[PDB]
Structures are given as structure tokens and as C-alpha cells.
């Protein structure tokens, strides 16, 4: 039965996910279900109740087609004149590609010889301030430099078991002192729906000219594209936030030892 | 038990390999039990030597080898060996210097891995692929274009049965006309595209195109070059689930696409199975 949830990490706009089956669309044959998936539909304003957009996308006519680039991707593109979802008609018409580890839990099992159709099953809603999020730059988040140490966040989540992903903040030039500097941060947790599951950091208190980080938010389907596929539709919520000093570039990780940092002195705070 | 394989793609005497390690990430704290938390692989890349695999094999399962979980835009594994080598000099490189990876290409659960614990990558299986390597850049790869034709191939594997599929991009071509079945099977037939699979971060495809390369074919399929195509780029998650069997092409289909994903819309795919022999399988 179709549900649809909303989220609101709290720190008119709203950012739209919707999950479903890839199945066969010849009405031939039947409608067999290959694999499971999603449709990231990006941001968009709108006032209507959740319910009724759910509604809508449920009626949509969705086409993927399997293709290829650097790796398996997966093109999703509608066939439905829209009503509600007009804020998302950028997407829904042009057509859109992505990497089909990151919306889809099978790619290898979606025939080419067989159209396909994105039966959406469940929607997810994520309120929004700004008219979009931002997110840290590829770039700025994969640079290693000699000397430097990357300050890091392990974060666990209860999943209504645990599991754990990583962030990575930023970097400094190469102690009780760090607990007192991440303190003055005045770090704000929450977490929200942008391609699954996300974590969204804003820096309440002072910060050292840092530059790479003012809300930040980092999908779980960059960080663990398997693991964001795993919590899909499921009821996440962050149960502990550790601070790990790390060295940057990979020939320091002989000589320099990780710093694990617990909270306890309001180091982080969970919305 | 530790078991090594060589794999020959088959497409010089110099005794060039590729080195490719499977194991167990698990716990080194001599006070507490070796705890396997995840498997993984330690691509260890191209290195020349004339040592029997088997000496290879056991020289890699003494190694110590720290595993160390870290992020960067994504999940990271770092490896490095604290163990002077002997025969695995040739790949001493990656070894001695560290090297970090995407840790969904090397790892099948890299959340279970503690950061709180030293870790460890037990070697438990060496992988050898011979060589006489090249790969398309990703800039090429992932580029869309406007009127364009998508060359790709469907190549299905029988994992020794099951079967799984993987899509490659070779490279794209300018839409005129309308090319026929048989006008496009005659020109990709011309090509002489021979394809093999090697052991490149777990399962790869190669392929070489021993005949007349296409003038509109926008490709870096050189006159005898050969290009490899690593499964851990292609799907990383079925590569994972490929590390340890040994698998088989049984299938090439040639699937012509549109580029740009606004076209998806208004072309459609044609597929092109595999008779006249177009693609020759080693």
C-alpha cells in the first residue's frame, strides 16, 4: 500500500523522494518486478497535502531505461501531464540520470529488451528553508593534504539494530584543547531525507576560518550508497556523534594514530 | 585455506601482473579474539616477476597488513604493511607508501568495521592477471552529448549456473538517415572487437579491436590497444559479489543508445545479438 512520510530536520520548500519497484510495462506480458529503486525529484515549493501528492505520483506513468557511462545507470523520465507536482516538472519531464547503485538495488536484473515502468509505492518529504540545500563540494571533500589532520564524525543511527557512516568536516594544519574548539563550534545535528537518508550539520557557535564549511547537508548515498539503499524505508534516528582526528593523506596513517573524542561536555546537540 | 589463481586474458615475454588480494578485515589486539568484522579485496596493481604463484601466495599470507576506515566524500579504507617483502617487491609501491580506496569497491561492510579497535586484512586469496594496462578515462566515459548514439554492450556472465549482466560504454557516434539492422552489424563486425576476462579489481573485460576502426565512431579503441574495463567501476556491489568464482562470457549484445537523457524520450534502444560473429570471446 503507497505511504508517504515527512521530515523535518528543524535547523514552503520541500525536497521530494520517492521509492518503487522497476517492473515490466508491456501489458503483453506481466508486470514482473526486476528490482527496486528510487527517483530523487529534488527541491520544489509547494502547499499541497502530503497525502494528495502521494496520490499523484502513485497515477504517474515512469520510464527507466538501463544505460551505461563510467558505470550502470539508470534514465527516468514521465509520461503523465502534472497538477501537483508542476514544482517538480524539471525533472519529471527533461528526464534525468543517475548511478543505478545509488537508486537501485539490482540494476543487473532490469531487462533491456522489456520496457520498464517505476511503479512509485512510497514518498518522502523533506521541509526546507533556503529553496534548495548546500552541500559541500566534491573537490573540497576528497582533498588529502601532507600535514594536516582531517576532523571526522562517526555517527550512529538506531534503525526502527545500529549502523555507523562517517563525515568528514574539513582540515587543519598539524589534546583536551580540540574538545574545547569543536565545543566553540556550537555543532547542531538533525537528519533528514535528501536522497534517503541525510545528516545535516549547522554551525551554531565561532569557527576558525574553516572555509570548507551556513547549514550543511550530506546524503548518506554519497557517503554509503549501499548502506542509504538499506535504510530506505526505515525510521532513523542519531544515538551517538564521535569526533575522530585522523591524518589526511594515506602514508601519515603509519606514523599517526586516530583520536577518538566522546561528547560530554555539549560538544553536539540532536534535533 | 589460501588459495591463489592465475588468469591469462590471452590478447609479451616480460612477465607483467596484476596483483589483486582477498582477505579478512578483522581485530589485531592480541588481548582480545581476532573478530572478522568485514571482507575485502587489496588491489595491489602492475608489477614484473617470474615467482611461482604459490610463493607469492605464501610470502602475501604473512604479511601484516593495517586496515584503517577513514571518509572523504565518500567511505575509505587505508592499507599499508608493516612486513619487509621479498618477492612482492615489484608492488612494494602500494605496500610500504599506503594506499586508501573507495571502501564499497574493497569492502563488503565497511560501517562494521570499528575505528575504536586495530584492524587487520588477514590475506586469505591472491588473484593474478597476466599482461603484455589501459582504461578509458572517466571524463571520456561519463560524457553526454546532444544527437547522439551510445555504443554500449549488455555482456552476461555464467558465474561457474547463475547468470549476471553488465552494461559498458565503448563510445559515441553523431546521429544522421537511419542507420539499418544489418548497416550497423556490418560496421561493428568491421571493428574485429575480441573480448576476454581478466582478474583487474576482481572481474574485468577486455577488449581489443583487431580490425578497421570506424571514422565516425568517437572511441579509444586504438589500432592494438587493448582496454580494460574493471567490474569495480562498471558495479561495484556485483563485482563484490563475483571476488571469489570464476565466471565466463557467454553473451555480447550490442545496445545502441541515446546520450543525453532528454532523448530517451524520442529514441529508443536497438539491440543487437550476437551472429556474423561481431564479438569474438577468448
Known amino acids: 500500500v503507497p505511504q ?7 535547523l514552503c520548500f520541500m525536497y521530494m523522494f520517492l521509492l518503487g519497484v522497476v517492473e515490466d510495462s508491456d501489458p503483453l506480458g506481466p508486470p ?9 525529484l529534488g527541491v520544489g515549493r509547494s502547499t499541497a497535502k502530503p497525502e494528495e501528492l502521494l496520490k499523484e505520483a502513485t497515477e504517474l506513468d515512469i520510464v527507466v531505461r538501463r544505460t551505461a557511462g563510467l558505470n550502470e545507470k539508470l534514465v527516468f523520465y514521465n509520461n503523465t501531464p502534472l497538477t501537483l507536482l508542476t514544482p517538480w516538472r524539471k525533472v519529471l519531464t527533461t528526464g534525468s540520470v543517475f ?26 518529504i523533506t521541509r526546507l528553508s533556503d529553496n534548495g540545500y548546500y552541500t559541500v563540494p566534491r573537490r573540497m571533500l576528497e582533498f588529502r593534504s601532507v600535514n594536516a589532520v582531517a576532523f571526522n564524525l562517526l555517527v550512529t543511527l538506531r534503525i526502527d539494530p545500529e549502523a555507523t557512516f562517517m563525515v568528514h568536516i574539513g582540515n587543519f594544519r ?3 584543547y580540540c574538545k574545547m574548539k569543536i565545543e566553540k563550534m556550537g555543532l547542531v545535528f538533525a537528519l533528514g531525507g535528501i536522497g534517503g537518508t541525510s545528516l545535516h550539520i549547522r554551525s551554531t557557535g565561532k ?13 548518506l548515498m554519497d557517503i554509503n550508497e549501499d548502506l542509504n539503499r538499506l535504510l530506505w524505508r526505515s525510521r532513523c534516528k ?4 564521535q569526533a575522530v582526528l585522523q591524518p589526511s593523506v594515506p602514508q601519515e596513517f603509519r606514523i599517526y594514530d586516530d583520536v577518538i573524542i566522546n561528547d560530554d561536555q555539549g560538544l553536539f546537540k540532536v534535533l
Request: proline share 8%; with cysteine.
Open 99 to 124: 548511478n543505478a547503485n545509488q537508486v537501485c538495488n539490482a540494476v543487473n536484473l532490469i531487462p533491456l529488451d522489456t520496457p520498464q515502468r517505476f511503479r512509485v509505492v512510497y514518498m518522502s
Open 174 to 176: 598539524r589534546a583536551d
Open 32 to 40: 514482473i518486478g526486476r528490482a527496486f529503486g528510487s527517483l530523487p
Open 238 to 241: 542519531i544515538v551517538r556523534i
Open 207 to 219: 569557527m576558525s576560518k574553516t572555509l570548507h564549511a551556513k547549514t550543511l547537508c550530506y546524503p
Open 4 to 10: 508517504v512520510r515527512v521530515i523535518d530536520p528543524g
